XYZ file of C-alpha atoms in Angstrom:
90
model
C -5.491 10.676 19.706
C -3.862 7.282 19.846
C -5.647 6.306 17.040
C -4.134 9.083 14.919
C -0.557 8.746 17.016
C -0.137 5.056 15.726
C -1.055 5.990 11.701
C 1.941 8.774 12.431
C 4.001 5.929 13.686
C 3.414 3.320 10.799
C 4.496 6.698 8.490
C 7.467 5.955 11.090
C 8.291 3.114 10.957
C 8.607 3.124 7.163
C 11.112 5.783 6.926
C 15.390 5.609 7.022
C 17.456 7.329 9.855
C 17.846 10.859 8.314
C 14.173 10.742 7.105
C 13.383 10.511 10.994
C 16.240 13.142 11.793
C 14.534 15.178 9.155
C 11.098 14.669 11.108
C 12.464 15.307 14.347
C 14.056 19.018 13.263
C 10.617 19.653 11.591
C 8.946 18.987 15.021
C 11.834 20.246 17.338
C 10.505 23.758 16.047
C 7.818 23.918 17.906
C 9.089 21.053 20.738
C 10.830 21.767 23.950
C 14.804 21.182 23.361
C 14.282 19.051 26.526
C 11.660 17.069 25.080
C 13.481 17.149 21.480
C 16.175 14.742 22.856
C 13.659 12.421 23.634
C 12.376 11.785 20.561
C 13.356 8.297 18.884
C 10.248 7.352 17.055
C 7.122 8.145 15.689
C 4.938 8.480 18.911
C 7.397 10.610 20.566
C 7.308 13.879 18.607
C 3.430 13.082 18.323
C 3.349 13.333 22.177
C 5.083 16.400 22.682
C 3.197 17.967 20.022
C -0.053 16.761 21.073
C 0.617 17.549 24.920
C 1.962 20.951 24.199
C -0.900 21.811 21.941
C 1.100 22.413 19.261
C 0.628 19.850 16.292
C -1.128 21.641 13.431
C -1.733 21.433 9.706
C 1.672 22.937 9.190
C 3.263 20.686 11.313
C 1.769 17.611 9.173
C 2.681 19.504 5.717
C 6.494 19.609 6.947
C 5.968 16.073 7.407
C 4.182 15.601 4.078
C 6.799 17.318 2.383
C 9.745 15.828 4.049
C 8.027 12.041 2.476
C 8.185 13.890 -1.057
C 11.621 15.184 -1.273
C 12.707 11.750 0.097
C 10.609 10.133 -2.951
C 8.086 8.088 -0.858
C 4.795 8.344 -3.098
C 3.667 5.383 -0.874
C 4.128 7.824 2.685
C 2.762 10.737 1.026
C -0.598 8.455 -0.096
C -0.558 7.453 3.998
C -0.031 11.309 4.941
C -3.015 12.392 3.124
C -5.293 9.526 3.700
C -4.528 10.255 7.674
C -4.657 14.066 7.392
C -8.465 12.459 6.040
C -8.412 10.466 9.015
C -7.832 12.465 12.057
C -10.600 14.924 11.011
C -12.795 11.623 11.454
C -11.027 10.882 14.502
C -11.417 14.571 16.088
């Protein structure tokens, strides 16, 4: 979904350095430690979730929730408008 990888990186590229830290942990769960080194921006921990099948709902709500604790109403508005999205894209 490239569509649905660059809406995850605009959420990216409107974040600080720990808020992508915090993003990165929340996806290293489930990504490779090889491939969790790798990840810089917004695309990259899309692409080793998408190619290792394992981006979910869960996944998304970890980022959701990372956006609300960091006080981002306008990324959490984005979140949900693209977890909207990529059920239009899929």
């Amino acid at each position: 979904m490239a569509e649905y990888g660059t809406l995850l990186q605009d959420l990216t590229n409107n974040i600080t350095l720990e808020d992508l830290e915090q993003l990165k942990s929340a996806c290293k769960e489930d990504i490779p430690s090889e491939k969790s080194e790798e990840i810089t921006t917004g695309s990259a921990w899309f692409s080793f979730l998408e190619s290792h099948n394992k981006l979910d709902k869960d996944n998304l709500s970890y980022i959701e929730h990372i956006f609300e604790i960091s006080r981002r109403p306008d990324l959490l508005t984005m979140v949900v408008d693209y977890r909207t999205r990529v059920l239009k894209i899929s």
